[PDB]
């Protein structure tokens, strides 16, 4: 835990298709 | 250049703005309620409320009536800016508490 997973990874699913 | 997302309902619009209904497709109570709250947090806004006219349609009708200081479009744009800022503050605080833990 205590990890900023969202900063580390460049999201793709979250953007609208 | 999305030309279908948010529409201005002209039959519900006044002269010189300050009172307008916007139709926002692919929206529901999630954005409607937060937007209404933020918009009511504006001194010039005298009236704000949304409605999903029918569950079958993914459509949201948000009504803004202001006093004469600003137009409904300006109050809407300010509401969206303020919602973005609020979510940014939430993001910063939450990521900081995650890092600290």
């Amino acid at each position: 835990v205590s990890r900023d997973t969202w900063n580390t990874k460049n999201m793709r699913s979250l953007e609208p298709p | 250049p999305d030309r279908e997302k948010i529409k201005l309902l002209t039959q519900a619009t006044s002269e010189d703005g300050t009172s307008a209904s916007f139709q926002i497709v692919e929206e529901d109570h999630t954005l409607g309620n937060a937007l209404r709250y933020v918009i009511m947090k504006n001194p010039d806004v005298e009236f704000c409320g949304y409605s999903i006219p029918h569950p079958s349609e993914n459509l949201l009708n948000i009504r803004i009536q202001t006093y004469g200081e600003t137009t409904a479009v300006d109050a809407l744009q300010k509401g969206l800016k303020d919602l973005m800022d609020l979510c940014d503050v939430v993001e910063s605080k939450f990521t900081e508490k995650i890092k600290s833990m």
Binding site: - | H29, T30, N33, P55
Partner: protein, 338 residues
Amino acid sequence: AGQNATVAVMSYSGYDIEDALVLNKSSIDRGFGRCETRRKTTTVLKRYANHTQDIIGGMRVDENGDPIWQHQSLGPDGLGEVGMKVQSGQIYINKSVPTNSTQYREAPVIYRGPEPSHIDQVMMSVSDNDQALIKVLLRQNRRPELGDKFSSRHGQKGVCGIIVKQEDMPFNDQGIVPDIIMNPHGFPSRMTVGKMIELISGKAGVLNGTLEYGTCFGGSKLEDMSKILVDQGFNYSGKDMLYSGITGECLQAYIFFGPIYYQKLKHMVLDKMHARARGPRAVLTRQPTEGRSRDGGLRLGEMERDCVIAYGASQLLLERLMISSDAFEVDVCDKCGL
């Protein structure tokens, strides 16, 4: 026969008036209220006086060697393959009848269904009188929709009036959402206090880990169930404080909230929806058929006729009764009224 629906007894969304129910989408998505229909069709390859019998020859193809659409799920024997979907218009028994019972007139068994079915059993056998017997079982998985009928063991039936997303449903402190919302106006006039006692008994039962009893002139005592509810942290009367799903605010009334046994009744709007524009007419009367299976029309009876007369709608009378049922352009002699 039923499922223990998480029920919140509250007025909600306005689609739950006069016994209509509010069903939780994503309870339905997870399998709440899911059911299947299984229907049988029986054919006999009968035998004939001229040493002849019916056959199940078929599965013809087009130029490529590809089966035609009506035979898409048929299989070489001419009996619909087990596991395959059959749509409206497709053949699953390819019955050919002799033209002189050599030549075989086609009498295929067509699937005429609004919704597709699946073939799960094809049984080939002979009857006691020596002749082949074919039975094909068609299964149709059904998902609950608007107009499907549910009941709660207390005579409080009602159709599904709206299916709402889980986030729109009210939630308690633990995030539990109702699977069904039962309107509170169905209680005061019907006076089913046993339904409320059942909600409390079932709630205390799940919390305690035990199935409870509602035996006539007995059952689990209400005060003992209240003791269980309080010991588990809940209000004794079964009323939890809920949050609105659409606003997030606490509802100003405490909501009677807990498990209730619900039955999905056989009456499903999928089997009731019927619409006729033009179709078969009776050979005698030339009027639309009387059967929903025969694409029949909806009768406009003497009482509806009385209503339309009371409105004074003469042209509507003509249109409904003569023009759109049986209008005949006859030739009438003006000398003899014949």
